[PDB]
Write a protein that binds this ligand. Structure first.
Ligand SMILES: [Cl-]
Ligand SMILES: [Cl-]
Ligand SMILES: [Cl-]
Ligand SMILES: [Cl-]
Ligand SMILES: [Cl-]
Lengths: 180, 180
């Protein structure tokens, strides 16, 4: 046409970027978010946004298939006046690690459980802007942890769970937040 | 606010995301790249791209100020049919860590020096697609390392340098790559 052929340049206005993982395998392209709210869900009639059921995956594991069938309506991420909220719209708990959810003086970040229908503030811009975790050596060596949130469907990880690391979880998300 | 519309919250077409760092401080908003090539520079005549001199950094270190100016014309990042290439357009070496630059059987990833005027394939889609590093425990625990490239201007880090960690470098980039 006239405007249908041109490719626009990039921008600084996408407020987060989402990566979907199955265990150690990244599934599908990254989803870069512009509008203030996004559903992340399994099948097309179940939300407006990032559809995970459409992603072609090489991981055919039975456990991954079972968790995928439990994602259902998934989660919603929404920018609000006081930060970014994650709402659990699905019928199973989700588990979240975010640097802005924890006491800045702790030695390690915790994984937080969010029951179906409950919400949690995934990201706080003011706290992230000034965040130092001086007692967390891994954090100081990997400061991008300050703006990357990890979310697992159905299965928890870390202390008091079978899986020590998030990359053992069947279905999980990496959410990278812009500073904004 | 008054008319119905067909919302798409985001897109999959930005092929990498660039974060600029000064030591342990993230500086400026993330840049989501859609154009085939991106110039990243401190000062480039009639330059159009990701200008690091315009950002208003909180890092007031004199070393950071000196290195920032040395970036000069910076680097060029180009997405091509055969992968993503980095061209060093500055007067100083740059230093790059990328999982697709290394022997997959090694224990830890190396930092690679790129002279002024030289190029390197910073990211290879097919090598990354299902890259496994079975002797690298950190990589298996943090598989997103396989899609993220770190680039430092002027100053090296790692094995052969006083700086052990990337977050000790005065001026560096985190580049998060999308899949093909
Ligand atoms: Cl912009
Ligand atoms: Cl484990
Ligand atoms: Cl798209
Ligand atoms: Cl080298
Ligand atoms: Cl160091």
């Amino acid at each position: 046409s006239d405007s249908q052929l041109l490719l626009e340049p990039g921008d600084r206005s996408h407020w987060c970027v989402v990566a979907y993982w199955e265990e150690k395998t990244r599934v599908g392209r990254l989803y870069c978010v512009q509008e203030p709210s996004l559903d992340i869900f399994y099948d097309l009639p179940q939300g407006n946004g990032f559809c995970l059921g459409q992603l072609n995956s090489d991981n055919k594991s039975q456990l991954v298939q079972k968790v995928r069938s439990k994602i259902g309506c998934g989660i919603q991420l929404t920018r609000e006046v006081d930060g970014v909220w994650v709402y659990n719209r699905s019928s199973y708990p989700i588990f979240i690690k975010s640097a802005t959810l924890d006491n800045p003086d702790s030695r390690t970040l915790l994984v937080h459980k969010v029951f179906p229908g409950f919400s949690i503030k995934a990201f706080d811009y003011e706290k992230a802007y000034s965040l130092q975790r001086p007692n967390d050596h891994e954090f100081m060596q990997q400061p991008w942890t300050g703006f990357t949130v990890q979310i697992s469907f159905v299965k928890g990880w870390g202390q008091c769970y079978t899986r020590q690391f998030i990359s053992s979880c069947p279905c999980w998300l990496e959410v990278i937040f812009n500073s904004r």
